[PDB]
A paper describes a structure:
Classical Zn2+-dependent deac(et)ylases play fundamental regulatory roles in life and are well characterized in eukaryotes regarding their structures, substrates and physiological roles. Structurally, these enzymes are composed of a central eight-stranded parallel β-sheet flanked by α-helices on each site, known as the α/β-arginase/deacetylase fold. All active site residues were conserved, as shown by the multiple sequence alignment and the structural alignment, suggesting a general acid/base catalytic mechanism for the bacterial enzymes as described for the eukaryotic counterparts. These enzymes mediate catalysis using a penta-coordinated catalytic Zn2+ ion coordinated by two aspartates and a histidine (KpHdaH (1b): Asp181, Asp269, His183).
A double-His motif, (KpHdaH (1b): His143/His144) plays an important role during catalysis. The first His (KpHdaH: His143) of this tandem His motif acts as an electrostatic catalyst during catalysis, i.e. it orients and polarizes the catalytic water molecule, and it is itself oriented and polarized by an Asp (KpHdaH (1b): Asp179). The second His (KpHdaH: His144) acts as a general base abstracting a proton from the catalytic water molecule, thereby activating the water molecule for nucleophilic attack on the carbonyl carbon of the acetyl/amide-group, i.e. the acetyl-lysine, the acetylated polyamine or the small molecule amide. A mutation of the second His in KpHdaH (KpHdaH H144A) leads to an inactivation of the enzyme while not affecting the overall conformation. We also analyzed catalytically inactive enzymes obtained by mutation of an active site catalytic His residue, as control.
Numbering used by the authors:
A (entry chain A), B (entry chain A), C (entry chain A), D (entry chain A): 2 to 371
Write the structure that this text describes.
């Protein structure tokens, strides 16, 4: 069975964003935290890898790092003025990169590394070195616009990997499925006019970017039909998210026929996340990984790459990423998620569950899938 | 205008619950936090008072502490075996108090103090020393059963205050309205068979206690009709919570005619809370405080007491408690909640908002109010 | 007995210095802290006041805040270009203020406030409103040069207070005694050429500024003889520090005859401090406060002002500041310093103690006091 | 050149000691920390390994874990009643293990693992698999008595490794050199009556155990002459510690002729440590490692094992352990310790340096080495 790669580097846990009280910059009426405030902490991601190690999983994966993405890699997506300006703050120690977007010293080099991990994960899977692969890419990428940092993201990790594979390995169609709980606004924008990449985003209605739902934004020119947004109702849990995958996402894969499936894998839809209002647990992420691995098996030789995005519950995200790596690798450790049964009990009752399914039905109909 | 009391003591910020990774005890597969993990931190509550101070509000309130609740106060609600056992862990340093319930050294004396603050707040308002009053009671109370600690609560702060007022000041009918996002399971239980206290709970369907909704639990014997549960759908925000107050809660007050309204005032329905999935902001809590103050004005001489319960978003709860104290005191500081506009944009769209209103309509009909 | 003022403001705990791993800025080879790294935390100072409150001491003191120091106050010490530049970083959020000196948003206004507390403490004591007084001035002042921030200090808190008293209340001679464990380099510099202020500094040989001892730096022109440095050997404890006070400091007061004694009161000579290597405990600071209060009683009507400087042991400094406030107020709470006996056992044996005394003897002889 | 082993396991960073304000248990007058208080944090040790990784050093070492020490391994040093009692608290979650000694859930299994790492490090070097070796053994061992936990230590890591090597690999004489800044009281006690292990301890006079210096404690019966204590004066720095090694320690090795040298390698003599008052920097530890490696080269085939003990400066210990691993491996990374020059300037002047040398001279004479 499965040779699964896990692309990670200690340096990615060193990127800092300065002083934050959870999401809020310090000053004015925001008192400095006595804690280690700032949701996008290394700890969310490190805890995952630590739990992989202690669970026994890590030795059974193909561990790898990567060379950082080259200047030329970056330029397939981002214009120089943007790259130069992000490099210039990095080389200061700090400043700010336009409205709500702060880094720290050496964030440039670390963001290039984060994007490189994604690049290498894509390549190893495409070449048949690995059956599938995960990339613990920090900082994340899915909100980054070509010319504007957004949502803790500074480079477009997945698009950079994809355009590199398109240029150096003749990658054809590719589907990017984004189950981070925020909209994949950066991916969507980059591929809006293109029919060669299907971009699909499951997200919390109105969460981030705020007030954006997106269901009627289908793509432009040749790209029309090749973008799919699924604005799930805040509050939704396991039944809704899996219904959405099975009723919309997988059929959408079946129709488009990718050579490769990429997950934008955020865990911030988990039931304890401060940055959204969804009720997923470890088994939810386990199942979704199953659904996309199996589609990948039917459609593109099992070729699945997952790239870490968001996730801000420091105690709970590790149980979710473990489950993901377990489904992805085919290997089951002894860890039992200590909150699984508690979150199962918290799930919306049938009235909501049916309302949400109805809504997902109307979207599948709207997108020509039902 | 308003002489508003604010009952607080430094000692309440000293109660500790040991080593937690947010909600999870440390050990097994739960790695020790490098942060200061444990949601029920002093910081959530201290930050509120700190922001009151820097905003200029604090000097314009009547600040008070209190003698702790007496043994005899405690015994109106709790049996000795329970009190003795909680005292015995407190006097050890720690142990545990049955399934998921941990304290620290001296938590007994501090819980007695927390309950005393609530007692004194009730009395000062009843005697006409104060128009209204808030009690920064930590640890909280609303989940505590007579004989079982639950949900970070060790004593039944509000019932202890109420039965003390019933015995020493001839308090008659009283309504307790609980807008902490978890069920007021402890209040409900204590007053289940009684017609002299109306207990009303707005809470997230199935959140805590897990899997409990409660709409058909109306009370027993004489107490039938005198308990009201409102299980709001996870995901709901400002429109829903205020609709619920106006369509169910206030009419329910109007019908029952209390001599006193007490809020169980949790802030964990705020949009960034890790311990629930609701989307309230500072203006939401401001409005709800307005609605209950005005009912209090019409029905019981303006006599409103608020007692702090839950709230786990360290950066955002202070803006919410400020707003509450501002509505309660009648005084508006210069602070503008820096997330207000962002959370407003995140609010559920009209499809959900109408579904939730419909559900609230059917409950008002079920409870004989519409 | 004693009307003791305690000048403090919540705003002083809001000044931030950004992301630090204890003393080290983040980046390069310095990994971001998962803790709340940065020695100059609010917590060191807040913990002191919290322990005063819970000990029962606080209600028995005259609590006060202050108007911030005026622009004109600041200009008696600092040139405009320096003030304008510090104001400009404050109004950015951050930058940096030359070699190793970082602030946060609104640090300007908070530093003005910190200095105002010292100003008001000096005035209240001088006017006979208060017998004596403490100022919890954060950020500290004693390392600040007129035109350069240094050692976490941005304004010269004590000199600003003194020159304001000199200009508005005809203050004559004043002695400033600095038992912060670092050199009072800022005070020394401001008063180097002046005979009207005696500046005395007890400090760790070579600690901060690094490699500075200072014994032969006595003052310039009229100021010659009116500066006294006492470079204590790293490692020294209670016996040494009290010997130094009694053999050098108090006699030096006796000779100069001040109208006022001011302590630069740092606690970083405590035995657990990461920022020096001295072995003082709570009773050490208690005794030193006694020695200077009694000199003040003999020489200037009991007029003693203490102004908080350094101190970086978060768990231990509060016990030390409590002891100080207890000696200063004349009031003994029930708190017993839980480390007192342990640190007493750690004290240097007689060989060192005698070597240190010898060294202090040779300095008293050198300064014409023995 | 050198095949250097580095024995570490993620599980050792999971051992917890509950709620501490640096060294102080929470309760009474000790306020709960808002930080992550408790000096013996995982972070001190993790930061070292993280910096090894980012510096490029780690891939050039032989990384290994180990099976935990067996029950039988443990019993060569510890009696069952002690083992059973420590196991019983571990299996509770917590309690306490006599006067000032707290663990957490699963500390037993993790302490066995920590001791196993030391066992395996000793064996690999003895068998000629590795030239030398380091063991990141957490929790530490050097203060543990057979029947009493002490100083954050629960098992006697180094003695357990040594007696296992004595029983399974015919290990003869061995020298244990302890440059943790606290006395090696546990090692000393275990080997007090024995001539086959030389135990040498450099430590801060009176620090821990408190009030113990130890110079005249030489050993009992056959063990007389085979224990050496060097009580350095609090305050001492690089010149003193290296003088002590060269004038006492190395000659003492030369005389005894071990088959193996073991360092008890604590970093708490570093200049920023809250738990002692010494002024060492990264180059200090680098040099000491050089001196003992070279003795090892002359005397026992280069066979040197180092086992991690104490070290509580979270930002500075990593630079020190890096330097150690660099000297031990023979490999120099690009990292420059950003505090090296600052701490060099802080070093005691010549008067102290000469006083300390004199004291070390008199000890070498007393021990028959000069
Ligand atoms: K998404
Ligand atoms: K597209
Ligand atoms: K409720
Ligand atoms: K009732
Ligand atoms: K000083
Ligand atoms: K002078
Ligand atoms: K030692
Ligand atoms: K021996
Ligand atoms: Zn996200
Ligand atoms: Zn479920
Ligand atoms: Zn709650
Ligand atoms: Zn709204
Ligand atoms: Zn200082
Ligand atoms: Zn002493
Ligand atoms: Zn040590
Ligand atoms: Zn040096």
């Amino acid at each position: 069975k499965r040779k699964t790669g896990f692309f990670f580097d200690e340096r990615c846990f060193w990127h800092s964003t300065g002083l934050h009280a959870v999401t809020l910059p310090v000053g004015g009426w925001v008192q400095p935290p006595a804690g280690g405030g700032h949701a996008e902490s290394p700890e969310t991601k490190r805890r995952m890898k630590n739990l992989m190690d202690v669970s026994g999983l890590t030795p059974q994966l193909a561990l790898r790092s990567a060379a950082p993405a080259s200047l030329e890699d970056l330029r397939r997506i981002h214009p120089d003025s943007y790259l130069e300006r992000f490099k210039a703050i990095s080389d200061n120690g700090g400043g700010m990169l336009g409205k709500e977007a702060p880094l720290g010293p050496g964030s440039y080099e670390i963001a290039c590394l984060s994007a490189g991990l994604a690049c290498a994960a894509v390549e190893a899977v495409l070449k048949g070195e690995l059956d599938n692969a995960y990339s613990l890419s920090r900082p994340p990428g899915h909100a980054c616009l070509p010319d504007q940092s957004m949502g803790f993201c500074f480079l477009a990790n997945i698009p950079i990997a994809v355009e590199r594979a398109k240029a150096q390995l003749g990658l054809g169609k590719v589907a990017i499925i984004d189950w981070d709980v925020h909209h994949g606004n950066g991916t969507q924008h980059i591929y809006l006019q293109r029919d060669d990449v299907l971009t699909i985003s499951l997200h919390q209605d109105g969460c981030f970017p705020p007030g954006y739902a997106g269901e009627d934004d289908r793509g432009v020119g040749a790209g029309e039909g090749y973008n799919i947004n699924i604005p799930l109702l805040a509050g939704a849990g396991d039944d809704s998210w899996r219904y959405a995958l099975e009723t919309i996402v997988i059929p959408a894969l079946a129709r488009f026929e990718p050579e490769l499936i990429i997950i934008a894998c955020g865990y911030d839809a988990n039931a304890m996340d401060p940055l959204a209002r969804m009720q997923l647990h470890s088994d939810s992420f386990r199942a979704m990984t199953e659904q996309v691995q199996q589609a990948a098996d039917r459609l593109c030789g099992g070729k699945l790459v997952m790239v870490h995005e968001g996730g801000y519950a420091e105690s709970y995200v590790p149980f979710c990423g473990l489950a993901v790596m377990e489904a992805l690798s085919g290997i089951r450790t002894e860890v039992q998620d200590p909150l699984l049964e508690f979150i199962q009990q918290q799930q919306p009752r049938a009235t909501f569950a049916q309302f949400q399914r109805q809504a997902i039905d109307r979207l599948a109909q709207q997108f020509g899938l039902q």
